[PDB]
Symmetry: C2
Subunit: 98 residues, 2 copies
């Protein structure tokens, strides 16, 4: 039944969560966010916070240049931030993809 | 594990599907009172407002910053479901 709820969030929020895993000491999520503008990334939880890691290897050259004109530069970098700002972040991304 | 995902989506998208239910129906509350409770049924999408529990004061706060149709029950293609969520999200402020 979880499968169906994923499907809902994808159409409702344009986000998909694929896999879950604790490695090192951190809960990591493979996230996919789109609208054909798609930004892949991982969210890792090692609260002491959230660690954002862009996944650009599925991205073609054109798509990268396209995202560059939409996403802030720091979206292509690895970062860290608290949960209070996770929706801020998600929004920032969603808005960027128009 | 499938519940940690529910939580992720909650923080991430500021919307929780309380429960899943002739046709897939879902309980949904959106917001961080300025919170919208509604249901979505998939037959084409069907949007069902849920004012069943709000105070007249809440009904008033919401009706202040929300497009009218948000209070009527309506239908539209899946294709524009997200553009819909954005309106709601960006309306509750």
């Amino acid at each position: 039944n979880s499968e169906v709820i994923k499907d809902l969030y994808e159409y409702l929020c344009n986000v998909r969560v694929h896999k879950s895993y604790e490695d090192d000491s951190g809960l990591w999520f493979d996230i996919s966010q789109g609208t054909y503008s798609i930004m892949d990334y991982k969210l890792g939880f090692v609260k002491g916070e959230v660690i954002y890691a862009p996944v650009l290897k599925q991205r073609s050259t054109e798509e990268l240049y396209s995202l560059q004109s939409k996403l802030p530069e720091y979206m292509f970098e690895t970062l860290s931030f608290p949960l209070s700002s996770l929706n801020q972040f998600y929004n920032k991304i969603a808005k960027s993809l128009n």
